Each structure stands twice: as structure tokens, then as C-alpha cells.
Design a protein around this ligand. Structure first.
Ligand SMILES: C[As](C)(=O)[O-]
Length: 263
């Protein structure tokens, strides 16, 4: 029931030692389950969804732009280049870059997209264009990972990101072809196994983008299809008091189990 969900989330937060942010949107009736849903949390890598979506939006006008190439140079590399490191001295299309940053959370791929787009400010501009006035991307990787308490840079709220993810994957923020590609990329993510997914029934279909940064900030945003029922959009953000706190993916899994029970 709705009161036991609240009691349980509060208990989970107390047990975690950190600050928990949750926003679930049930598209069946647009009902919502909220917990610190209007509070700001550092987005970490979950901001990569808005970024890849900004590129997809461009492809709606500029035909074939997803195939535009960008050179990958040693100097472009960062602290995380699972895919990009294989293309040094070669090129990658915006599509390949989008796929790498979304499914492997490649930081270099992210920066290449930011460069193409003209900077973090233009990603924020795209968020605004889909009705998100909370989201704000201020820096590139890996600086956007500082997650300093009280610092609003590179942050957003659970509800704002939930609403945006919904518009992007199920709503009309993107055109049909672009929308389908984003959904497919999210479903093909390889980094969310121990997060939101871990707290859901194994047969449910899911698309998600994880995030993890300083202050033990552990995040994950997803679109969930429970069997043949209407899709669910869930955002689970979590951050801790210690700058060097270890990540708690298990906390996101627990939050997911709690808010999707009986859905
Ligand atoms: C590769 As990462 C920890 O910024 O999602």
C-alpha cells in the first residue's frame, strides 16, 4: 500500500546512512511515488541519457548526422574509455559514441558528444526544451563527478529526471525512430545488473542508465515494463556524507523492490 512504501523507504534511508531520492511514475494512471523527489542530487553518469538524447534530437533534422565521424585521439582519453580506447587513431560516429556512453558509460564518448553539441550548456538547453527546468549540466567528465554537498552544479531532482526520462522514452520529446533507438540503447546497458534491475522480477523488461560518483553517490534511472502492464519510470538517487564513501548499488535495488511491489 502507499503508506507502507513511505515507511519502508524512510527505514531504508536510515539504514543506509545517506540521503535517498526516489521518484516512480506509473504511466498506467500517472500516479507517483515520491521520496525527496524535489531535492537535488548530483546526476553523475545518468546525465549521459539527456546528452545522447540531445544528439538523437538533432538527427530528426540533420539527416545522417548519427553517422558523422569524430576522431579519437590519445589526448581525448579520460579515466574510463572501455570502448573509445579501441578507436585511438581512428574515428567513431555519433551513434557509436552514443552507444558507448550509454551502455558502457564511456566518459570519453560523453565528452566527444558534449564537444559536438557545443558544451554542457546545450544539453541543459535540450532538457529545457522538453520541459525540464531543474536539470543543469555544468561540466564535462570527469569533473561533473565531484558531487559536493550543497553544490547545484551537474544536479537535478528525482522527479524532474523521471518526468524527462518518460517524455524521452514513452512521450513525444523525440520522434519515432529516435525514440526507438534510445529505448534500445537503454535496454542494452551492461552496467545496471546490481542496481534497479537487482530489485525487480527477473522477467520484467528494463532500460536504464547507471551513475556513480564522489560522496558515494550511487544513481540509476530506468524505464520498466512489468509483464504486459503499463510501463513504469523510476529514478533512484543516493548520496552519502563521506567524500570517499563506497557506492551502494544494493540501496538502489532495495528502493526499487519497495516501490515496484505489486506493480
Ligand atoms: C563509468 As561512471 C562510474 O561515470 O558511470
Amino acid at each position: 500500500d502507499v503508506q507502507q512504501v513511505q515507511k519502508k523507504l524512510a527505514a531504508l534511508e536510515k539504514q543506509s546512512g545517506g540521503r535517498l531520492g526516489v521518484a516512480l511514475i506509473n504511466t498506467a494512471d500517472n500516479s507517483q511515488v515520491l521520496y525527496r523527489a524535489d531535492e537535488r542530487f548530483a546526476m553523475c553518469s545518468t546525465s549521459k541519457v539527456m546528452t545522447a538524447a540531445a544528439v538523437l534530437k538533432q538527427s530528426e533534422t540533420h539527416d545522417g548526422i548519427l553517422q558523422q565521424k569524430m576522431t579519437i585521439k590519445k589526448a581525448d582519453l579520460t579515466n574510463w574509455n572501455p570502448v573509445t580506447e579501441k578507436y585511438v587513431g581512428n574515428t567513431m560516429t555519433l551513434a557509436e559514441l552514443s552507444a558507448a556512453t550509454l551502455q558502457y558509460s564511456d566518459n570519453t564518448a560523453m565528452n566527444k558528444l558534449l564537444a559536438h553539441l557545443g558544451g554542457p550548456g546545450n544539453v541543459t538547453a535540450f532538457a529545457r526544451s522538453i520541459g525540464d527546468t531543474t536539470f543543469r549540466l555544468d561540466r564535462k567528465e570527469p569533473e561533473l563527478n565531484t558531487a559536493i554537498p550543497g553544490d547545484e552544479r551537474d544536479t537535478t531532482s528525482p522527479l524532474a529526471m523521471a518526468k524527462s526520462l518518460r517524455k524521452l522514452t514513452l512521450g513525444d520529446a523525440l520522434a519515432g525512430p529516435q525514440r526507438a533507438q534510445l529505448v534500445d540503447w537503454l535496454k542494452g546497458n551492461t552496467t545496471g545488473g546490481q542496481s534497479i534491475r537487482a530489485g525487480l522480477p527477473a522477467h520484467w523488461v528494463v532500460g536504464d542508465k547507471t551513475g556513480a560518483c564522489d560522496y558515494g553517490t550511487t544513481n540509476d534511472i530506468a524505464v520498466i515494463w512489468p509483464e504486459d502492464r503499463a510501463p513504469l519510470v523510476l529514478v533512484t538517487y543516493f548520496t552519502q556524507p563521506q567524500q570517499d564513501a563506497k557506492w551502494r548499488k544494493d540501496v538502489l535495488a532495495a528502493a526499487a523492490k519497495i516501490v515496484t511491489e505489486g506493480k
